[PDB]
Amino acid sequence: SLHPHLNANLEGGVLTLAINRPEAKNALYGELYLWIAKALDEADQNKDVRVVVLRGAEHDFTAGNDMKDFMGFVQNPNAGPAGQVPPFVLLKSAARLSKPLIIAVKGVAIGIGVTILLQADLVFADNTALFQIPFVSLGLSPEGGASQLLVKQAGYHKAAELLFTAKKFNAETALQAGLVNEIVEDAYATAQATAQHLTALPLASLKQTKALMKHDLDQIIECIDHEAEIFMQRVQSPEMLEAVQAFM
């Protein structure tokens, strides 16, 4: 389906999904998380798509959860299963994509801008990238399976430093922690050349290799869901509501 703030282009088996909400530096709201999730789900069924590239359209990847949206949410929270709240739907859609998923990062990549990297196979950034996992300082808790995936990808000590302190960090830190594969001059051209190289390789080899690497997908999904339950406890906490009420 066509929707604002998300451009899709398919050429030579490469599907490029580009977040395009510059007025807000690509902050994500409820329905945009779902539109991105649906596009991933449809790409995986589309026989003309072999590789997906997800990035921003321009100078930023994502400023994270839209704060205006978030404050309306805290005052009227989704009462359904925590795992069906929009950001967890996107993160699971990404985790389950059977085809290679490449992400290219410029500028801000905050919250979900970091945890979605843990669902991608390859990540390229340039030196303008500025990352943060702000969940602790917002009064929230991990999402995207990061309590387990970031410990595995970065090592326990580094994962605890980025999660506990909630600090901003640069591309060299993200590269040392294994969140980014390489820092390059043109993140978007590199992501596109890599995607073209992958479409020239056998689809079945790629699909099977990825399926073996992700043999524990069911447990990853379980981790995302159980995190989501704890995350909603924090979203619904009395202290969160008072703080939003004041702010508003």
Cβ proximity to a copy of itself: between 31 and 160 the closer is 160
CB of 2 to a copy of itself, least distance (A): 30
Cβ proximity to a copy of itself: between 9 and 164 the closer is 164
Phi, psi of 178 (to 5 degrees): 80, 10
CB of 5 to a copy of itself, least distance (A): 27
CB of 98 to a copy of itself, least distance (A): 13
CB of 230 to a copy of itself, least distance (A): 5
Cβ proximity to a copy of itself: between 25 and 111 the closer is 111
* Positions that interact with a copy of itself (CB under 8 A): 100, 118, 120-123, 135-142, 147-149, 151-161, 163-166, 178-181, 194, 197-198, 201-202, 204-206, 208-210, 212-213, 215, 226-227, 230, 233-234, 237, 239
Phi, psi of 198 (to 5 degrees): -65, -35
What Rg, from alpha-carbon coordinates, does the chain have?
17
Cβ proximity to a copy of itself: between 67 and 160 the closer is 160
Contact 24, 66 (CB under 8 A): yes
Cβ proximity to a copy of itself: between 72 and 134 the closer is 134
Cα separation, 121 vs 126, whole angstroms: 17
Cβ proximity to a copy of itself: between 34 and 203 the closer is 203
CB of 1 to a copy of itself, least distance (A): 30
CB of 88 to a copy of itself, least distance (A): 15
Cβ of 68: how many Cβ atoms within 10 Å? 12
